[PDB]
Amino acid sequence: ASYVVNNENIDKDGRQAYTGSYSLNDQRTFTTIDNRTNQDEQTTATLKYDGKKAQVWVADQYITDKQAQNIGREFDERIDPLIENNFGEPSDVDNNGKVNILVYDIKDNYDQTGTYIGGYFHPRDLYNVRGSNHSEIFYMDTYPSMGTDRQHLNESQIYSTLAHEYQHMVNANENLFKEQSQEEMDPWLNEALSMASEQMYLNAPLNSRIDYYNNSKSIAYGHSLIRWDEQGDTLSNYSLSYLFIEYLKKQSDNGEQVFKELINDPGDTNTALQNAIHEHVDPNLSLSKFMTNFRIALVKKENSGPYGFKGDADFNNVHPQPISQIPETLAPQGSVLFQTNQDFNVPNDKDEDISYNKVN
Ligand SMILES: C[As](C)(=O)[O-]
Ligand SMILES: [Ca+2]
Ligand SMILES: [Ca+2]
Ligand SMILES: [Ca+2]
Ligand SMILES: [Zn+2]
């Protein structure tokens, strides 16, 4: 027998719950971040593309003009329409109608660890504060994101990351500047939506995120969907966020159109999700139960109903790893798949937020 065990608390900051007893070539200097030390530093870049919606600034001398033009055209022709039609629009704090794409070798510890940063967006750039470039800008890595041969960097490897970062930018605009609350979306769902935009751009599933899900020990032993593990196994959060937003896409009667509704909802993140579920999934289904159903769907993948992804083949290789010993506690929206071949009774002293759901 197997059971999906979930902490149904939707407060990401909630407590541990007990599971029970048993001109071209112009120059500009930008602030960048040395991610080995988190110190600000200065990077001078050259303008290599000046298009309708994007300016491509280059500060890696191995990148050619044609490569920079390819990046700019991809943004103007494909990324910007995708994001504006399905997610939102950027701020324009510098009043120029465009966004900056700074293409350079993001500084990190890849040489020592093999882990690298591909790109990022920093909301401080939208304000008059220390380190700000006072512009819509996102930062795109060259080496090793485009490959490990600096003589043959493949710029098209970064294109889906363009969508990822632009989603962060327009999400920030809506929630920080266009809404009274000026409160960011909860990071787990902001990242989810960035990864949804990557899948839309690629017209293909993010198989590396699924592979990571399938091999993650932290996920198998209860990693939280909503508590973002900044200091620990952050890749597990990326994988859970991605699968959740794809689950919502498949469960929603308006599919990908739900993404912009989540961003533009004036409520907090859980309110936005609850509204989407009530309007597009089931008017009597709570967010907490929808999230439990998500965990069940990863296991069963039923070709119809709440316990799957509507048979979408993009998700057929997802395989939750069962465990034999349930952790003593689970974080909010942390879940495990428990299997036993002996008789099993749900503990009567489990915390009320812990739900046991028999699979098979
Ligand atoms: C790829 As990122 C650092 O914008 O989540
Ligand atoms: Ca601008
Ligand atoms: Ca780099
Ligand atoms: Ca909002
Ligand atoms: Zn992101």
DSSP 25-53: T-EEEEEEEETTTTEEEEEEEEEEEE-SS
- Sheet containing 322-323: which strands, arranged edge to edge? 322-323, 335-339, 2-7, 354-358
Q: What does residue 159 show for φ and ψ, rounded to 5 degrees?
A: -60, -45
> What does the radius of gyration of the chain's CA atoms come to, in whole angstroms?
22
Residues, beta carbon < 5 Å, ion ligand 3: 105-106, 141, 143
For Cα atoms 229, 235, 237, give the angle at the middle one, nearest 5 degrees.
55
Give the burial string for 134-162 (b: 16+ CB within 10 Å, else e). ebbbbbbbbbbbbeeeeeebebeebbbbb
CA distance 97 to 264: 21
Residues 32 and 158 in one domain: yes
User: Does any ligand 1 atom lie closer than 6 A to the CB of residue 106?
Assistant: no
- Ligand 1 pocket test, pick from 137, 141, 165 with the greatest ligand atom count within 8 Å of Cβ, gives 165
- Number of residues written out for the chain: 360
Alpha helices per DSSP H over 158-268: 159-172, 187-202, 207-215, 217-220, 234-251, 258-264
Give the torsion through C-alpha atoms of 313, 10, 276, 254, to 10 deg.
Answer: 0
**115 Cβ contact list (under 8 Å, min separation 6):** 108, 109
Q: Per the domain annotation, does 198 fall within a domain?
A: no
Structure tokens at 244: 């959740």
165 belongs to the catalytic site: yes
ω into 144 cis (within 30 of 0): yes
Q: Give the span between the Cα atoms of 219 and 102, in whole angstroms.
A: 34
C-beta 168 within 6 A of ligand 1: yes
Count Cβ atoms within 10 A of the Cβ of residue 324 and give its class: 0-12 exposed, 13-18 middle, 19 or more buried: exposed
Q: Do residue 329 and residue 354 come from a single domain?
A: yes
How far apart are the CA of 324 and the centre of ligand 1, in A?
Answer: 34
- Cβ–ligand 1 distance for 118 under 6 Å, the answer yes
Strands 54-58 and 119-120: unpaired
What is the signed CA dihedral for 314, 315, 316, 319, rounded to 10 degrees?
150
Resolved by: X-ray
Query: What is the enclosing helix (H) or strand (E) of 141?
Result: strand 137-141
Annotated binding site for Zn(2+): 164-165, 168, 191
Handedness of CA 49, 73, 166, 192 (dihedral sign): negative
Ranges of H-type helices in 61-155: 65-74, 80-86, 110-113
Residue 266: give the domain boundaries. Answer: 2-19+210-358
Please work out, in degrees rounded to the nearest 5, the angle formed at the alpha carbon of residue 68 by the alpha carbons of 64 and 74. 145
State CA 303 to chain mean position distance. Answer: 25
Name the one residue in this structure whose structure tokens are 């083949």: 313
Q: Which residue has the least CA distance to atom 4 on ligand 1?
A: 120
Is residue 197 within 8 Å of 79, Cβ to Cβ? no
Q: Does the CB atom of residue 122 touch ligand 1 within 6 A?
A: no
Token pair, residue 189, equals: 């769902």
64 and 10 housed in the same domain: no
Atom of ligand 1 nearest to the CA of 165: 4
- Whether residues 148 and 244 share a domain: the answer is no
d(CA 69, CA 268): 39
Ligand showing the shortest atom-to-Cα distance for residue 92: 2
Quickly count: other Cβ atoms within 10 Å of residue 268's Cβ: 14
In a domain, 343, yes or no: yes
Angle formed by the axes of helices 159-172 and 187-202, nearest 10°: 140
Out of 8, 74, 155, 165, the active site residue is 165
In a domain, 89, yes or no: yes
Give the strands of the sheet with 39-50, arranged side by side: 27-34, 39-50, 54-58, 99-104, 137-141, 119-120
Q: What amino acid is encoded at 320 in this protein?
A: P
Is the domain of 15 the same as that of 31? no
Query: Is the residue at 262 inside a domain?
Result: yes
